[PDB]
Scaffold this active site. Structure first.
Site, PDB file in Angstrom:
ATOM      1  N   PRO A  49       0.824  -1.228   0.000  1.00 16.03           N
ATOM      2  CA  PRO A  49       0.000   0.000   0.000  1.00 16.03           C
ATOM      3  C   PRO A  49       0.850   1.266   0.000  1.00 16.03           C
ATOM      4  O   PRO A  49       2.044   1.230   0.299  1.00 16.03           O
ATOM      5  CB  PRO A  49      -0.866  -0.052   1.251  1.00 16.03           C
ATOM      6  N   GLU A  50       0.224   2.384  -0.347  1.00 15.56           N
ATOM      7  CA  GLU A  50       0.905   3.672  -0.358  1.00 15.56           C
ATOM      8  C   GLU A  50       0.282   4.501   0.766  1.00 15.56           C
ATOM      9  O   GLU A  50      -0.593   4.004   1.472  1.00 15.56           O
ATOM     10  CB  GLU A  50       0.757   4.319  -1.741  1.00 15.56           C
TER      11      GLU A  50
END
Ligand SMILES: [Zn+2]
Length: 271
Positions: A1-2
């Site tokens: 994820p970011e």
DNA sequence: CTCTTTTTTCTCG
DNA sequence: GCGAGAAACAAAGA
């Protein structure tokens, strides 16, 4: 994820596990706890979750009075809140059991990490990581940003991915940001003029804050936390190879830049 | 079966 | 220090 996805997970955890007393902690993959699993198990069992913070793409559990559990989800890490009788899933590695449920961490590639440190070691930890400013108007100073870009010959995409100019951008949002700012991913930063740097600066903040607002980009994911995102429906270039740019109508292309898949519009993003 | 594709940090020259 | 390539690791597709 970011950053957007991690922030979404952070918010859900804050709303659901804060105030919860850890009954027990178990691991099928203890090696992912870089500071030692048995040590973490001994230190945290019986302690209560006081809050959940985030720095860049790092999730921070505030436990007990002076404990800080630093978690990085890397490429495929996923958390889920399940019942105590929930069946084990193949890639589950750790679980924090509470009285009414459990927080399970799964990671197919086993890249994710857990590190237990003290409250006063958090700031030094991130200084050592050299993490840049959070992507907000208050923390992300365009002046310093501009001077760093003017000093380097690095390509803008790889430089932005370093987390040093600003924290939080990953492959998806860096591609989306450069398309929005009309900058080609291979452009050497010292070649960016002031007006372009300004648009880039604002685009980074706008894109990430919009992504946070929409619960991040979720492309599947079971009942995992942060899986109800709607940002994926707003993506203009990432994974849109062959489709037409929403601005000029040209076909979105995909190339490799510094080993990463890179999506861009050849018309809107002049090399 | 082989090769490629999908965050952080180190090796090599 | 810097760029290139790769490793940590698993699975799905060409
Ligand atoms: Zn275009």
């Amino acid at each position: 994820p970011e950053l957007p996805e991690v922030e979404t997970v952070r918010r859900e955890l804050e709303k659901r596990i804060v105030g919860q007393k850890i009954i027990s902690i178990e691991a099928t993959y203890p090696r992912m706890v870089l500071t030692g699993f048995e040590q973490l198990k001994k230190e945290l069992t019986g302690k209560t979750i006081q809050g959940i913070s985030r720095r860049g793409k790092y999730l921070i559990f505030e436990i007990g009075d002076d404990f800080r559990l630093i978690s990085h989800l890397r490429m495929e890490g996923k958390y889920r809140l399940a019942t105590l009788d929930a069946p084990r899933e193949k890639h589950d590695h750790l679980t924090m059991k509470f009285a009414d449920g459990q927080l399970i961490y799964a990671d197919v590639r086993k890249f994710g990490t857990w590190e237990l440190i003290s409250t006063d070691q958090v700031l030094p930890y991130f200084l050592k990581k050299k993490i840049g400013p959070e992507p907000t108007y208050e923390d992300f100073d365009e002046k310093l940003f501009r001077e760093k870009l003017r000093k380097s010959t690095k390509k803008i995409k790889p430089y932005l991915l370093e987390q040093t100019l600003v924290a939080g951008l990953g492959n998806i949002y860096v591609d989306e940001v450069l398309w929005l700012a009309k900058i080609h991913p291979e452009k050497e930063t010292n070649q960016l003029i002031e007006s372009s740097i300004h648009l880039l600066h604002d685009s980074i903040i706008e894109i990430l804050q919009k992504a946070i607002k929409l619960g991040g980009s979720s492309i599947r994911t079971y009942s995992a936390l942060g899986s109800t995102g709607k940002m994926q429906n707003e993506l203009q270039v990432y994974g849109k190879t062959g489709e037409k740019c929403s601005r000029c109508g040209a076909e979105i292309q995909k190339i490799k830049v510094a080993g990463r898949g890179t999506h861009f519009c050849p018309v809107c993003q002049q090399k």
